[PDB]
Amino acid sequence: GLPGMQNLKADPEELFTKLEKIGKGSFGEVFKGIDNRTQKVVAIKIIDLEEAEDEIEDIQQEITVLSQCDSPYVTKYYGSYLKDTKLWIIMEYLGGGSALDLLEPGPLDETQIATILREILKGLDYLHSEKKIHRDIKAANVLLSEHGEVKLADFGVAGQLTDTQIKRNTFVGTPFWMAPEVIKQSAYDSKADIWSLGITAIELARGEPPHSELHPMKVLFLIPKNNPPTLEGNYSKPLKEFVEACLNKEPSFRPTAKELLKHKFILRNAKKTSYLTELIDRYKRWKAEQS
Numbered sequence: 001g002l003p004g005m006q007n008l009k010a011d012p013e014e015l016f017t018k019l020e021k022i023g024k025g026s027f028g029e030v031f032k033g034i035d036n037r038t039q040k041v042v043a044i045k046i047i048d049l050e051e052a053e054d055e056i057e058d059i060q061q062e063i064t065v066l067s068q069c070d071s072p073y074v075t076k077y078y079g080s081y082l083k084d085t086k087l088w089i090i091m092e093y094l095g096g097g098s099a100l101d102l103l104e105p106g107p108l109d110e111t112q113i114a115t116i117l118r119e120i121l122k123g124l125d126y127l128h129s130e131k132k133i134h135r136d137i138k139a140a141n142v143l144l145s146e147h148g149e150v151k152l153a154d155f156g157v158a159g160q161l162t163d164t165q166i167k168r169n170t171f172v173g174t175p176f177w178m179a180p181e182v183i184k185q186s187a188y189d190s191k192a193d194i195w196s197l198g199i200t201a202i203e204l205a206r207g208e209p210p211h212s213e214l215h216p217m218k219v220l221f222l223i224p225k226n227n228p229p230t231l232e233g234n235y236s237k238p239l240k241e242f243v244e245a246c247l248n249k250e251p252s253f254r255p256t257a258k259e260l261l262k263h264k265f266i267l268r269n270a271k272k273t274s275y276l277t278e279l280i281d282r283y284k285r286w287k288a289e290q291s
């Protein structure tokens with residue numbers, strides 16, 4: 001039996017037109033598409049069920065997590081469709097690129113960092129209030145619309161807390177952004193995303209997370225052992241303090257996403273998301289001139 005496949009639909013090519021590959025997500029490739037009813041563009045993640053073996057359990061979970069989320073700060077999921085051996089996961093299309101792509105041309109200023117962080121924080125506050133942990137917070141999983149709207153994506157390793165399960169222990173995430181308690185596979189909760197957010201703040205400020213030049217197996221001992229990273233360089237005192245607050249080895253000392261929305265760094269520097277179109281244009285100009 002399948003509880004999370006209650007709303008599984010059929011015949012997706014009757015309502016959608018599949019177009020070109022735009023990238024990769026957890027367990028499958030993502031394609032551009034069109035909703036034939038509205039003419040709006042969508043993202044269509046295709047998961048080949050034949051090639052899937054142990055990830056099948058997580059694929060059922062990813063559909064469930066995306067279906068249980070309804071927020072402007074999380075990529076909307078429009079439905080899952082079964083077509084022969086292929087599962088289509090219809091998602092909100094976001095044409096502005098990821099925060100990681102927007103870092104490719106050069107550094108961000110502190111207004112841009114604060115704006116991106118505030119929107120990530122609203123997404124985290126939403127998820128954490130619904131007892132969900134993203135577990136893969138990093139600039140690559142932060143997507144923008146063509147108008148600068150910022151949303152969380154890729155719920156492939158997302159965790160769910162329940163009344164019977166108050167903590168998780170699974171070794172999941174991207175090593176450079178993982179919380180120490182996650183690597184140690186100790187009992188953890190939403191505070192693990194607050195650590196990941198602090199690493200993401202360093203990544204938005206410096207362009208790369210701490211230890212980025214090291215093999216990921218080495219960071220698996222360095223992170224639990226070393227003092228937590230700090231933001232080094234000529235950055236404002238509130239930004240350094242925002243990073244420091246997130247990167248506490250003791251998870252209970254990390255503030256919540258709700259508390260961080262009131263941080264001096266966010267309050268002083270975050271501006272309208274529409275201003276982020278300047279970063280999206282910088283990326284387009286940069287990409288067009290690359291050899």
Ligand SMILES: Cc1nc([C@H]2CN(c3ncnc4[nH]cc(-c5cccc(C#N)c5)c34)CCO2)no1
Nearest residue numbers: 022023024025026030043075092093094153154
């Ligand atoms: C390079 C490069 N990589 C890419 C990104 C683009 N990306 C999207 N592009 C547009 N609208 C979207 N809506 C949802 C996503 C999305 C992103 C990440 C994970 C998941 C999942 N699961 C979904 C998305 C798909 C991944 O590759 N573009 O250039």
